[PDB]
């Protein structure tokens, strides 16, 4: 029924200009208001603009953080919302949502108060504003039930895959989400828990991929 | 952001919470209610005065007084945890629309378990690479939040930590990481470095040695 579809994210510099877009279905969009909303990883949700429909003039609203380099257009012919983001900097990283906009307001109320809500949401596209190069991850033990892991260090840009004995082992293993340091640069670390009468008697090697960088690291973590 | 929310609360499995936005323009306008979980869109809960999409449970329900907005969930399940965001107009009269900064619902359920701690130190491998960071493994506690401190020799240390937000283990516990970066002479100018993890107020540590 009801589909949106945002497309466009990506990798882009500070300073640099990226274009989003929304392909919209199920819904009349010639008069659906259309709204983007932003989420930054690891934190809330932020209102960016919405375009209204032909009552209101196509009129564009936009958040005092993204007004001046951010420009939201609408094509009503293809059923798509766009967000022109320009002089894009880090505060701009990095889910992008598209959302059909709902109109509430009490009839006889009698004080003007209107308000809008978001009804129906694509799942977004993901833009990540960094000054960082491409780079591959240094992969570093963690030696030792027992715990052992992987380090996988000042990786750019994410995702990097863990897979663990090129994937035969599942159980126990924990691979944790990527912190993003200071330098820019990601890293994560994969932990399992092994037997410890296994210790120096089963091979454990972590199995690092980072496809941005063409990375292939496989890291036999040993005891000391 | 003229929408104020705590941060975080918990409720009981099967209990009822409610989550409150406070701000003036809630004294004219009504608000409306989002859930978001990690790797989802954001869904409506409830809008208006009185209106719950169709879709939604209806143990979610809406309420205002005053400059006060509120979702109440009436017989929290484990599929609730999540954030949950109110959003109205940014003040009275206004065209923009705006975001609360969030309330993440913890809905308990299961017993409290304390976290394991372990703290691995550089490997050889990284202090022949010119970088020393000691990885402080949390695991294996219920609920999903812990506070992390760390100390070299006795001092607290501030600087070149970073910490992951817990993540939910296989046996449905949880599961942290904290990271403290050091250049490897800093590693070798102490004599120890402590990871503590603090749980429900209590802390479990640590300690390490070059």
């Known amino acids: 029924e009801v589909r949106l579809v945002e497309s466009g994210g990506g990798l882009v510099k500070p300073g640099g200009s990226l274009r989003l877009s929304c392909s919209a279905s199920?819904?009349?969009?010639?008069?659906?208001?259309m709204t983007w909303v932003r989420q930054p990883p690891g934190k809330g949700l932020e209102w960016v603009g919405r375009?209204?429909?032909?009552?209101?003039?196509?009129?564009?609203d936009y958040a005092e953080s993204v007004k001046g380099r951010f420009t939201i257009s609408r094509d009503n012919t293809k059923n798509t919302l766009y967000l022109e983001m320009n002089n894009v900097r880090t505060e701009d990283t990095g889910y992008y949502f598209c959302?059909?906009?709902?109109?509430?307001?009490?009839?006889?109320?009698?004080?003007?108060?209107?308000?809008?809500?978001?009804?129906?949401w694509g799942q977004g596209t993901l833009v990540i504003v960094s000054s960082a190069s491409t780079k591959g991850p240094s992969v570093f033990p963690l030696a030792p039930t027992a715990a052992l892991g992987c380090l996988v260090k000042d990786y750019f840009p994410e995702p990097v895959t863990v897979s663990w004995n090129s994937g035969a082992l599942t159980s126990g293993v924990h691979t944790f989400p990527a912190v993003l340091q200071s330098s820019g640069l990601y890293s994560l670390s994969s932990v399992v828990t092994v037997p410890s009468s296994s210790l120096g008697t089963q091979t454990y090697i972590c199995n690092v991929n980072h496809k941005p960088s063409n990375t292939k690291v496989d890291k036999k973590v040993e005891p000391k | 952001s003229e929408l104020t929310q705590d941060p975080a609360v918990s409720v009981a499995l099967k209990q009822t919470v409610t989550i409150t936005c406070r701000g003036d323009?809630?004294?004219?306008?009504?608000a409306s209610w989002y859930q978001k979980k990690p790797g989802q869109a954001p869904v409506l809960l409830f809008y208006?005065?009185?209106n719950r999409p169709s879709g939604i449970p209806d143990r979610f329900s809406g309420s205002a007084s005053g400059n006060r907005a509120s979702l109440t969930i009436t017989g929290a399940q484990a599929e609730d945890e999540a954030d949950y965001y109110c959003?109205?107009?940014?003040?009275?009269?206004?065209?923009?629309?705006?975001f609360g900064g969030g309330t993440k619902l913890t809905v308990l359920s299961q017993p409290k378990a304390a976290p394991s701690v372990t703290l691995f130190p550089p490997s050889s491998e990284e202090l022949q690479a010119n970088k020393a960071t000691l990885v402080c493994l949390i695991s294996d506690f219920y609920p999903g939040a812990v506070t992390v401190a760390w100390k070299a020799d006795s001092s607290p240390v501030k600087a070149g930590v970073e910490t992951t937000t817990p993540s939910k283990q296989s046996n449905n516990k949880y599961a942290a990481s904290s990271y403290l970066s050091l250049t490897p002479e800093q590693w070798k100018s102490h004599r120890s470095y402590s990871c503590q993890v603090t749980h429900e107020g209590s802390t479990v540590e640590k300690t390490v040695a070059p």
């Open positions: 959302a059909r906009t709902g109109k509430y307001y009490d009839f006889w109320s009698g004080y003007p108060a209107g308000e809008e809500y978001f009804q129906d």
């Open positions: 208006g005065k009185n």
């Open positions: 199920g819904f009349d969009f010639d008069n659906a208001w």
């Open positions: 959003s109205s107009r940014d003040k009275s009269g206004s065209r923009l629309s705006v």
């Open positions: 323009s809630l004294r004219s306008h009504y």
């Open positions: 375009i209204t429909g032909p009552g209101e003039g196509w009129s564009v």
